[PDB]
Design a protein around this ligand. Structure first.
Ligand SMILES: [Mg+2]
Length: 456
């Protein structure tokens, strides 16, 4: 194990262990192991001590980054606590660190969370990624925290190649004339410290003077998914390929339907009037033209409201050029609208819902005159094909070369997602209640004061 309270240098702790064992040391730097440590337990045993969120999460961030900052090359987080939060003193004990963190304002917490985001922008390549995400309801767990709450996931512990291709498509083909961000770290909520997200891609988002992210009030945020069930090869007997050929030569909604229904578990579901969508995939059609063959009750009022707000703006479909024709270049061949909409019951709806809440929280804390407009949210779905013997070695999107070991993108669908306010408020409240119950049962020796948390 590693000691967040030890004064030993992490580089020395890790020196002389296998990479396997180093991974274990780093996993031990989690919020859960922090709260389980003898020194937190001892502090928490006192009658006067009733720890609050987000203050205890801020305290953890300090100890975490004091331990790991040098190893991951970002001493900015620790410097800020010491200089701006601790009055210039290098605090080492949990009682003092906690007290000073308890005295932070929302702009200081915002600043810390922004520095942490910047320190973690390489996401799962960063050795502290897994440890930092512990104890937090992240956007990939948000549906589970609201609707499931079972042992399929945990709050506390006490593929990527194709996603990168889709980012390149968004950046190069959809937003060539704009400032975009391709690499986002982990953004904790500065107001509660129980929620957090990382984003896949955003357009109209920049680094500011020193040296954090700036979301424009009108930025465009995209969650990227890849549909591996639809990966085909240009072979004689391949039924997906058959449907793809038709779509490529004649881009439109009918060719698209045949493509969707060329597999046994289709990504699109027809949902009739007053009927409850299943959770099976994340696109739904409300028009009978997509049919190729449970009612909403009065208690599904939140679902009804979400459908109401997600049944107007259509998806954009981008058919890409085939690099077997162009010997390399992949650009937009054709573009068309499809009456396909987000499934408001699907876990991806809940994922973007939480990313919207965190993005809007950070925009709210940003200094400056508030401007007219709110950000827009999308799911960007990529579809792919195997490389064949006659495909070029070197494919490109704009300047960017594709790794020769990644599949070729064929199709991009961009689907808008809208979030009614009352609906977001209810779901975040249920998830926060589940966080609080789970914190009390997991760390029952902590006299949690959730007064501040329920204010948020
Ligand atoms: Mg993604």
């Amino acid at each position: 194990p590693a000691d967040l309270f030890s004064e030993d240098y992490l580089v020395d702790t890790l020196d002389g262990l296998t990479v396997d064992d180093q991974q274990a040391v780093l996993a031990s730097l989690s919020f859960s192991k922090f709260l389980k440590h003898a020194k937190v337990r001892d502090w928490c045993a006192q009658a006067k001590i009733q720890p609050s969120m987000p203050a205890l999460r801020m305290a953890y961030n300090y100890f975490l980054f004091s331990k790991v900052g040098e190893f991951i090359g970002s001493e900015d987080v620790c410097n800020f606590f010491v200089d701006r939060v601790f009055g210039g003193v290098r605090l080492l004990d949990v009682a003092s660190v906690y007290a000073a963190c308890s005295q932070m304002n929302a702009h200081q917490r915002h600043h810390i969370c922004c520095l942490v985001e910047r320190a973690t922008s390489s996401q799962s390549l960063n050795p502290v990624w897994d440890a930092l995400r512990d104890g937090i309801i992240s956007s990939s767990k948000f549906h589970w925290a609201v609707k499931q709450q079972n042992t399929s996931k945990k709050i506390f512990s006490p593929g990527l190649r194709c996603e990168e291709v889709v980012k390149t498509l968004l950046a190069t083909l959809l937003h060539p004339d704009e400032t975009n961000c391709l690499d986002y770290g982990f953004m904790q909520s500065p107001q509660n410290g129980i929620f957090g997200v990382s984003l896949d891609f955003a357009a109209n988002v920049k680094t500011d003077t020193e040296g954090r992210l700036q979301f424009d009030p009108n930025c465009k945020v995209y969650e990227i998914k890849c549909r591996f069930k639809y990966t085909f090869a240009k072979m004689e007997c391949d039924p997906i390929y058959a449907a793809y050929q038709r779509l490529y030569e004649a881009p439109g909604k009918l060719a698209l339907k045949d493509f969707f229904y060329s597999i046994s578990k289709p990504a699109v579901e027809y949902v009739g009037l007053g009927k409850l969508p299943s959770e099976s995939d994340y696109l739904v059609a409300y028009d009978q033209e997509w049919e190729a063959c449970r009612k909403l009750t009065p208690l599904h009022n939140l679902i009804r409201e979400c459908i109401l707000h997600n049944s107007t703006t259509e998806s954009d479909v981008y058919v890409l050029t085939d690099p077997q024709d162009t010997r390399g270049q992949i650009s937009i061949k054709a573009r068309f609208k499809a009456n396909l909409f987000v499934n408001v019951r699907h876990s991806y709806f809940y994922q973007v819902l939480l990313q919207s809440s965190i993005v809007e929280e950070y925009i709210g804390l940003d200094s400056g005159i508030p401007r007219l407009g709110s950000p827009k949210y999308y799911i960007a779905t990529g579809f792919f094909r195997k490389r064949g013997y006659q495909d070029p070695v070197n494919c490109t999107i704009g300047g960017d070369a594709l790794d020769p070991h990644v599949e070729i993108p064929t199709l991009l669908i961009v689907t808008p997602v809208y979030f009614p306010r009352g609906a977001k408020h209810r779901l975040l409240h249920q998830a926060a209640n589940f966080w609080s119950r789970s914190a009390k049962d997991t760390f029952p020796y902590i006299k949690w004061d959730f007064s501040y948390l329920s204010a948020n």
